[PDB]
Amino acid sequence: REGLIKHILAKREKEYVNIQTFRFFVGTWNVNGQSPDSGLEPWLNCDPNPPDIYCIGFQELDLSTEAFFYFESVKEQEWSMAVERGLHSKAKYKKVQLVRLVGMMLLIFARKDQCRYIRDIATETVGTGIMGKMGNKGGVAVRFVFHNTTFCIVNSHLAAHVEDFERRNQDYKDICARMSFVVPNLPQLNIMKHEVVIWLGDLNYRLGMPDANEVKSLINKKDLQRLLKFDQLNIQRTQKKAFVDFNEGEIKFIPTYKYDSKTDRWDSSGKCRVPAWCDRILWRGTNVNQLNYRSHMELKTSDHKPVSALFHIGVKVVDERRYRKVFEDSVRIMDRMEN
Ligand SMILES: [Mg+2]
Numbered sequence: 660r661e662g663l664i665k666h667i668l669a670k671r672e673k674e675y676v677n678i679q680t681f682r683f684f685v686g687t688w689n690v691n692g693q694s695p696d697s698g699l700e701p702w703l704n705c706d707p708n709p710p711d712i713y714c715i716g717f718q719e720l721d722l723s724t725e726a727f728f729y730f731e732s733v734k735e736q737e738w739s740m741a742v743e744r745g746l747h748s749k750a751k752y753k754k755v756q757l758v759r760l761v762g763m764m765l766l767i768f769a770r771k772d773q774c775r776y777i778r779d780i781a782t783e784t785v786g787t788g789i790m791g792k793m794g795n796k797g798g799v800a801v802r803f804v805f806h807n808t809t810f811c812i813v814n815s816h817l818a819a820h821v822e823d824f825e826r827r828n829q830d831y832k833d834i835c836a837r838m839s840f841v842v843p844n845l846p847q848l849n850i851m852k853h854e855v856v857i858w859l860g861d862l863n864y865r866l867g868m869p870d871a872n873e874v875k876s877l878i879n880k881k882d883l884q885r886l887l888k889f890d891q892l893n894i895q896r897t898q899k900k901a902f903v904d905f906n907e908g909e910i911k912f913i914p915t916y917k918y919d920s921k922t923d924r925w926d927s928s929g930k931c932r933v934p935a936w937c938d939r940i941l942w943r944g945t946n947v948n949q950l951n952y953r954s955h956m957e958l959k960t961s962d963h964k965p966v967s968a969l970f971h972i973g974v975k976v977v978d979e980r981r982y983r984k985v986f987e988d989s990v991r992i993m994d995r996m997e998n
Contacts, residue, residue, distance in 0.1 A: 668991050675981035676807060678946055678973040681773075682883075684710035685813070685970065687859040688940050689963035691920070692722030692762070694737050696960040699745030705955070706969055709747035712805070713768035716814030718861045720762040726794060727761055727831050732819075742766055756801045758814075759783035761794035763860070765801050765814040776976075779966065781840035781848075787818075787830045798834045798860065802853060804841075807975040809936045811840075813855035815860040821933070824891045827863055828901035855944035855972060858905065861963070862939045864892035866914075871933040872891025875925060878913050886914075890936055905941040908952035908968065915954050915964040923956055938966045 686702060703713065714794060720731040741755060744769060753774050755767040763784070771779055780803040788795035798815035818826040839847045850856060857864045866874060867889040877886050887893055887910060895901045914934035917926040926932045940952065948971045955965045 663995065664791075664986070668986060671985050672807065672975070674695070675978050676975040677978060679768070679806075679976040680708075680946075681805075681974050682708065683712050683714060683808065683857070683970040683972050684967065685714040685716075685812075685857055685940055686965055686967045687716045687718075687861070687940060688958075688965040689718045689816075689861045689916075689938065689961060690738070690939070690974040691719050691963065692734075693920075693960040694734060694962055695803065696921070697958060699741055699958075701957050702965045702967060703745040704747050704957050705953075705967065706747070706951075709750035710769070710969070711770050711773055713742075713752065713766070714812050714843050714859070715742055715747060715762045715766045715768070716812075716859050717766075717870050718762055718814070718816040720759065720764050720876070722762065727793075728762070729794070732759070735764065737776065738764065739766060742768070750862060755803070756780055756782060757783040758799045758801055760786060760799045761818050763797065763799045765812060767801055767803075767812065777803055778805050778845050781842035781895070782800075782826060783838045783840055785834050785837045786931055787833045789956055796836070797830065799839075800834075800838055800850065802840050802848065807977060808973075809854040811848075811850055811856050813838075813850060813856065813858045813860075814919040815858070815862065817861065817863045819863050820907055821865040821867075821891075823870075824864060825893060826932050827864055827891075828895060832902045838952070846950070851943075852945075855942070855947060857940070857942050857970075858902075859940040859966075861937050862892060863935075863937050864890060864895065865935040866933060867891055867894065869903075869933065875935055883911065883913065887936075892936075892939060902941060905942045905943050906947075906949075907939065908949045910936065910952060912952075912954035912966075913956075915966055916962070918959070918962050918964065920962050921959050923959065926962070938963055940966060940968040947971075 787797035798919035802811035
């Protein structure tokens, strides 16, 4: 089986590849078990130029007992269709993948042009909730190759409560350890073995200061970088406890948690939660340049606000001509190997 040309062609990758730059939109929303009240265009259609791939991740899609015991959800449909109508107006998109575990759902959309360059798609889900196993929390993920560059997108809902930052670090360490994709037809890939890893969702890290009155006022006074020195995730990374070697963008939007449903008002409950930057987008990999990192106050469907981030990501895209010239060179040299 002298099909080693294929093997050779692989290892001469450099000679027929460019690093082309592509637009990835990534969004994350905790919908608090609600159906869409509104359009999603402010969230997804806020960039002049259209994205090339949309990575949208939801948490708490369905807070019912039925969803909690793995039964089908009407909300899965409701929110998929809601996103489809909300994508950019300057490019037709198609659905690459959907993955739900209870209320955690990741949708990948792709510009119609580019879908044919999406291969080897696999998906995992890992419940780290009740008894360390249940799907009330944990994470769902999708992986794939896009051209000759490997991606793996993780959507997570990590443990709640300000005190439990150590458990969130544990929920992270569990996902990394447990999640294992099985494609193509032998070796099982884990999350970190990919070329670009985008990690988003309700990571649930809170501000490491109790006094809620300070926080509300500091936020009110525009000074957010004082607040951000006490953000648990910022610390957990700094002290190398969790999310290394991940990057995050400068963060200039007011805390996305927690609001009074249907309003831009801070939580009025008797608990009276301290506001938090629960909803985050981190990444790992080269040729990744972030352009934006923002939230969308104008969507009042949930008690969380949606967060978005536009990325420029370099992808190794095959040049057909260089590929052919190389292929022809290789076979010519092979054929020439006749004693
Ligand atoms: Mg809830």
